[PDB]
C-alpha cells in the first residue's frame with residue numbers, strides 16, 4: 001500500500017499497533033509500510049525491567065518505573081488480550097496476579113507469534129516530529145545509538161505510543177537540601193531490600209504509595225509513614241505502617257507534618273505521580289493534559305483534533321489497560337486504512353465535549369471503570385476487534401475493589417474467571433506475603 | 446549591531462560569554478543582540494546545587510553533578526578571574542579551597558556586577574538548533590516551562606555552553622539486576638550521610654572516586670572500596686578504605702573482583718565519568734568526542750569547523766577552568782564581532798591537526814596542564830582579555846600535585862598566592878576533616 005507509518009514506542013501500545021496491522025494483513029488486506037522506533041534495547045515498555053535510574057546507557061531518560069517484586073495490581077483477567085489468551089500463551093491455568101516477568105513474557109508472546117519484531121528499530125530515540133504543510137507528511141528525526149547517527153525520514157501518519165507514567169511529577173518540600181537521607185521519586189525505586197531495617201516516608205496516597213509501601217513492608221523495613229494531601233488511603237495497614245496528613249518540612253533527620261507530629265526518617269520516596277511530556281513534539285502536535293479518564297483534544301480518545309493524521313495510544317488514565325490499547329490500536333488502524341472516515345472538525349469537537357461532560361459527572365471508583373468500559377465498548381463496536389464481556393469485566397473490577405478493602409495485604413491472594421475462556425484461575429502455590437522470589441521460573445513450577 | 450546571538454546555557458561558560466560582550470560594550474563598542482537560554486531557575490551551572498536527581502521538576506535531565514560538602518579540588522588561585530578578583534568579590538583574603546556555595550557566590554558576583562542577567566531566559570530548555578542554508582541563520586527551538594510553550598527564534602550565531610559532565614557514562618556489571626543495595630552514578634550522589642555506617646563500592650579511579658570516597662569517609666561510612674580498571678589511584682588511604690582490581694560481578698549482597706576476592710557491599714557508586722551529549726543538535730552541528738585536552742573539529746578549541754558560525758565553550762577536559770572559559774569566550778566574541786577573521790577551512794584543519802599531534806605526545810600530569818596553559822596563552826594573546834601569569838599558574842598546579850601525593854586527606858589544608866593580586870591566602874579556620882558545615886556563612890565567619 002502507498003502510505004508509510006511511524007510508530008513511536010514499542011511497549012504494550014506500540015506492540016498493539018503493530019499487532020493490529022499484522023492482523024489485517026493476515027486476514028488478507030494490503031497494509032501501509034510500518035516503522036516503529038524504540039529507545040530501549042527490547043520491547044515491553046514499563047514491563048521491561050532495568051536496574052538503571054535517571055538516565056540510561058545512552059543518556060536518554062530511563063523509561064521504566066518498575067521495581068523488583070512488582071506484581072500485577074489488578075486481575076490479569078481484566079487485561080487479557082481478546083485475540084491471544086492466557087490459556088494459549090502458557091498452555092495451563094495460572095493465578096490472578098502474576099509478577100512482572102510473567103506478564104512481560106505474555107505480552108511478548110503475542111508479538112513474537114505475530115512476527116512484527118522485524119518492523120522495530122531498537123536503541124533509537126525519537127527527537128523531533130514536524131508536520132510539513134506543503135507535502136502533507138511528517139518528518140521524524142531520530143538518534144540511532146547503535147550507529148551513533150542522527151537521521152530523518154518522512155511518514156504519512158504518526159502513531160504516538162511513548163507512555164505517560166515515565167516523567168516524574170516531583171514536588172519540592174522545605175528543607176530537602178538539608179535532609180541527609182536519600183530522596184527519590186517512585187520512578188527511581190528499584191529493590192525494596194535497599195530499605196531493610198529503615199524508616200521510610202512515602203509521600204502521596206495512590207497506587208504508587210500503596211504498592212511501594214507494601215514492598216518495603218514485605219522486605220523488612222523497620223517502619224513506614226504515608227502522608228496524604230487530600231484524604232487518606234484508608235486501608236488497615238500493618239503495625240509499623242501509619243498514615244498522617246501532609247509532610248510540611250524536613251530537617252537534617254526529621255519530617256514534620258500538619259499533624260504537629262514529627263519523627264526520624266531515613267529515606268523519602270515521592271509517590272506523587274507523573275506528567276505527560278513529549279520532548280519530540282511542538283505545540284501543533286503536543287498533548288497537554290493532567291492524568292485523567294478523558295483528556296481533551298482527542299477524537300475517540302485517540303485522534304489528535306488539530307492534525308488528524310497524528311494519533312495517540314493509551315494516554316488516558318488506566319483502569320482497563322492492555323485491551324483498551326488494543327481497542328484504540330484497531331481504531332487507529334482502521335482510520336489510517338480508510339475503513340472509518342473521520343467526521344468534520346466541528347463534529348469531533350462536539351463528540352469530545354460530550355465525553356468530557358460525562359467524565360465530570362463521575363464520583364465513585366465504580367462509575368469510573370464503568371465509564372472507561374463504555375469507552376472501550378464504543379471503540380470495539382467499530383472494529384473487527386473481537387467483542388468480550390465488558391459488563392462482566394467491570395464486575396471483576398468490583399470484586400477486586402472489595403478484596404482490597406477486606407485486606408490490603410492479601411488482595412493478590414484471590415482468583416477470577418477469564419472473560420475470554422471461562423476457566424477459573426487456580427489459587428497461587430504461595431501466599432503473597434511469603435512469595436519472596438519474583439521470578440517467572442518460580443511462579444510457574 | 447545588526448546581528449543576533451544565542452548562548453546555550455548559563456553556567457560559568459554562558460556567564461563568561463555574556464561577560465565578554467558586556468565588557469566590549471562597557472569599553473564603548475556596538476555589540477550584537479544577545480539571547481541566553483537556561484533550563485534551570487538560576488545561573489551557575491554545576492555550581493547551582495540541587496537535591497534533585499535524574500529528571501528535574503519539568504522533565505528535563507537534572508544537570509548538576511555536585512553534592513553536599515563539595516569543595517574546590519584545586520587551588521582557587523588557579524581559577525580566578527583576571528578581571529574580577531577574589532579580593533574584590535569578598536573584600537578580604539580567604540583560604541584556598543572554598544566550598545561550592547562559596548565559589549557559586551563568586552562566579553555570580555561578576556555577572557551581577559556586569560548587569561547581564563537581563564539577557565537570560567531561565568526555566569527554558571533548548572530542544573533543537575537547525576541551520577537554514579537559504580537565510581544563513583540558525584533556528585533555535587526551546588521550551589519555556591514557565592509558560593509551558595514551545596517557540597522558536599532565529600539567530601545569526603550560536604555559542605553552545607551546555608557542558609560535558611552532566612550526562613553520565615554508566616557501564617553495566619553482571620548481576621546488577623539482582624543486587625539489593627543502591628546502585629547509582631557519581632552524578633546522582635547527594636548527601637554522604639545517606640551512607641553513614643555502610644560499606645560502599647566506588648567503581649572508577651579519577652576525580653570522582655577520590656573525592657566521593659573522601660566525603661563518604663569524612664561523614665562516617667563504615668568501610669570503603671575502590672576498584673580500578675587500568676591502574677590504582679595509588680594514594681595512601683585511611684584504614685577502612687582499600688583499592689583493588691576491577692569489579693567483575695555482583696550477587697544479592699556481594700561484590701566480586703579480579704583479585705579473586707569478594708565481600709559484602711551496601712551501595713555501589715559508579716564513578717565512571719560522562720559523555721558529550723547534545724540532544725538538541727543534528728550531525729551537521731554535533732561535537733562527538735571522548736573527554737580529552739584536544740577535541741578535534743574545533744578551530745582554536747572553539748570554532749565548529751564544519752559551520753564556523755557555531756561555537757563551543759569549554760568542551761575540553763579541565764585542568765584550568767574558569768579562566769580558560771573566559772579566554773575562549775573572549776575569542777568567540779572577537780570572531781563574532783569581526784575583530785578576528787577566520788582562516789580558510791583547510792588552514793583550520795592543519796592547525797587543529799598540529800594541536801592533536803602535540804596532545805598525543807603528552808605523558809605526565811605536568812605536561813598536560815602545561816599544554817592547556819599553552820592553549821590558554823595563545824587564546825589570551827589574541828584578545829584584550831588581560832594576560833596573567835601562566836608559568837606561575839602552572840607552578841601552583843605543581844605544588845597542588847605534591848600536596849595531594851603527600852597526603853590525600855589534607856591537601857585542602859594548604860594555601861597559595863593569587864596570580865592576580867600577589868596576596869597569600871590565609872589558612873582556613875578549621876582543618877578540612879573537621880569542617881563539617883559546608884555553608885558559605887560558616888566558611889566566611
Ligand SMILES: Cc1cc2nc3c(=O)[nH]c(=O)nc-3n(C[C@H](O)[C@H](O)[C@H](O)COP(=O)(O)OP(=O)(O)OC[C@H]3O[C@@H](n4cnc5c(N)ncnc54)[C@H](O)[C@@H]3O)c2cc1C
Nearest residue numbers: 009011012013039045046072073125126162163165314321
Ligand atoms: C509502576 C507501574 C506499575 C504498573 N502496573 C500495572 C499493572 O499492574 N497492570 C496494568 O494493567 N497496568 C499497569 N501499569 C500501567 C502501564 O501504563 C501499562 O501497563 C503499560 O505499560 C502502558 O503501555 P504503553 O506502551 O502505552 O506505555 P509504556 O509501557 O510506558 O511504553 C512506552 C514505550 O515508549 C518508549 N519511548 C518513550 N519515549 C521514547 C522516545 N523518545 N524514543 C523512542 N522510544 C520512546 C519507551 O521506551 C517505552 O518502550 C503500571 C504502570 C507503572 C508506571
Ligand SMILES: Cc1cc2nc3c(=O)[nH]c(=O)nc-3n(C[C@H](O)[C@H](O)[C@H](O)COP(=O)(O)OP(=O)(O)OC[C@H]3O[C@@H](n4cnc5c(N)ncnc54)[C@H](O)[C@@H]3O)c2cc1C
Nearest residue numbers: 454456457458484490491510517518571607608610759766
Ligand atoms: C562533580 C564536579 C565537581 C567539579 N569541581 C570543580 C572544581 O572544584 N574546580 C573547577 O575548576 N571545576 C570543577 N568542575 C568542572 C566544571 O565543569 C566547571 O567548573 C564548570 O562547571 C564548567 O562550566 P560550563 O558552564 O562550561 O558547564 P556547566 O557548569 O555544566 O553548565 C552547563 C549549563 O548549561 C545548561 N544546559 C545544559 N543543557 C541545556 C539545555 N538543553 N537547555 C538549556 N540549558 C542547558 C545547564 O543548565 C547548565 O547551566 C567540577 C565538575 C563536576 C561535574
Ligand SMILES: Nc1ncnc2c1ncn2[C@@H]1O[C@H](COP(=O)(O)OP(=O)(O)OC[C@H]2OC[C@H](O)[C@@H]2O)[C@@H](O)[C@H]1OP(=O)(O)O
Nearest residue numbers: 165171203204205206207208209228229230271272273318
Ligand atoms: N505535593 C503533594 N503532596 C502530597 N501528595 C501529592 C502531592 N502532589 C501529588 N500528590 C499525590 O500523589 C498521588 C499521585 O497519584 P497518581 O496520579 O495515581 O500516581 P501513581 O504513581 O500512584 O500512579 C497510578 C497509576 O500508575 C500505574 C497504576 O496502575 C495507576 O494507573 C496522588 O495521591 C496525589 O494527589 P492527591 O491530592 O494525593 O489526591
Ligand SMILES: Nc1ncnc2c1ncn2[C@@H]1O[C@H](COP(=O)(O)OP(=O)(O)OC[C@H]2OC[C@H](O)[C@@H]2O)[C@@H](O)[C@H]1OP(=O)(O)O
Nearest residue numbers: 610616648649650651652653654674675716717718719763
Ligand atoms: N567499565 C569501567 N569499569 C571500571 N572503571 C571504569 C569503567 N569505565 C570507566 N571507568 C573509570 O571511570 C573514571 C572516569 O574518569 P573521568 O573521565 O575523570 O570521570 P570523573 O567523573 O572521575 O571525572 C570528573 C572530571 O570532572 C570534573 C573533575 O574536575 C574532572 O575533570 C576513570 O577512572 C575511568 O577510566 P580508567 O580506565 O578507569 O582510568
